Chains A and B, each alone.
Chain A
Amino acid sequence: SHMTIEQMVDRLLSYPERTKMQILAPIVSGKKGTHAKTLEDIRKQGYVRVRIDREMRELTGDIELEKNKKHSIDVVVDRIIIKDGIAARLADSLETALKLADGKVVVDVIGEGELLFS
């Protein structure tokens, strides 16, 4: 239910060394609208990479979404590899994503599936 950051970090640390992961903030899930204001704020906050409708796209690419169609937008906060000393970085990146997406974070494990924490 309500995981601590320690619990989240320790779960990711249970993966083998060299495991690649992307830490995502699921800011919009299955919602209609252009989401122009959202994309603007995230660009203004200095983020680079987003996943919009399952396409990895860059911010400041002039992104326009159809208003009357549902969209999902994930901010790609970090792209990490499990290795010695990553603990603090995992914590920080997880925290950043949780703040962005109002207490949810998605971890995409490359070669495996996704983990949802909250």
Chain B
Amino acid sequence: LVVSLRVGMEIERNALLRRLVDIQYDRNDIDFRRGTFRVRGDVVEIFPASRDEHCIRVEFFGDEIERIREVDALTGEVLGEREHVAIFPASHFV
């Protein structure tokens, strides 16, 4: 059920979106809350269900992930750069 993401991974943006919805993340372009994601063109930001985790920013170029960063969603600040990340379901009840 985990959604694995890595730089250079071939996946369409909307394919990632569907998979996130499948694991109980809601699209919320109007909130920063945990267990949702927001979409800004070819950038998808995922606010993990886990406390103490950072927002994950996934940058697409066509059907390829080009960059994955840990960010502060409130300020846009980049806190880390990643090769591989994994998103687990928003609830343990799936």
Contact = CB atoms under 8 A, between A and B. Distances in A.
A43 interface: yes
Interface of B: 13-14, 39-43, 45, 57, 59, 61-62, 71, 73, 75-76, 78
A15 to B, nearest CB: 16
Q: Of B39, B41, B75, B76, which is in contact with the most chain A CB atoms at under 10 Å from its CB?
A: B41
A27 interface: no
Taking residues whose C-beta sits less than 8 angstroms from the other chain, chain A's interface range is 20 to 34
Contact of B61 (A43, A59, A79): A79
Interface of A: 23, 43-48, 59-60, 76-81, 85, 88-89, 92-93, 96
Contacts of A85: 14
A92 B43 contact: no
B55 to A, nearest CB: 9
A47 B39 CA distance: 11
Contacts of B73: 46
A97 to B, nearest CB: 8
